């Protein structure tokens, strides 16, 4: 399952540019698969500056933890509350109710860092 138009991090996020020109981010139906049965996500702060690359939550399930990093540069402008109570979302909806955190993004040139749709898709079969 990997949405043809989004685009990917070598991580296993995906970045999704909304029709307010922000950009969502969570991580794909592979990443949840891979951590099983999720626990706690710890969100980012609301008003906080990242860099492209820059730790910035992280999703713990019954077995295992990762960091998420922010795809692109630029200042965190919601966090999904729901995954505080619901943090299962990340497994049923990775794409959808699962969302994690949406950056408002100070340098959009950083999307060529950011793998398209058949690049993630080679990622995974050479994973
Ligand atoms: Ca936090
Ligand atoms: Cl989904």
Redesign the pocket.
């Known amino acids: 399952?990997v949405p043809a138009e989004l685009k990917y991090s070598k991580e296993h996020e995906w970045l999704r540019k909304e029709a307010d020109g922000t950009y969502t981010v969570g991580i794909t139906?592979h990443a949840q698969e891979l951590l099983g049965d999720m626990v706690f996500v710890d969100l980012p702060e609301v008003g906080a500056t990242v860099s492209a690359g820059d730790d910035c939550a992280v999703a713990e399930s019954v077995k295992a933890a990762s960091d998420i990093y922010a795809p692109v540069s630029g200042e965190i402008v919601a966090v999904n509350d729901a995954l505080s109570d619901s943090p299962e979302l990340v497994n049923?909806?990775?794409?959808?109710?699962?969302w994690i955190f949406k950056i408002k993004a100070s340098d959009e040139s950083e999307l060529e860092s950011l793998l398209d749709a058949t690049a993630y898709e080679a990622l995974l079969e050479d994973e």
């Open positions: 399952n139906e049923s909806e990775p794409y959808a109710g699962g």
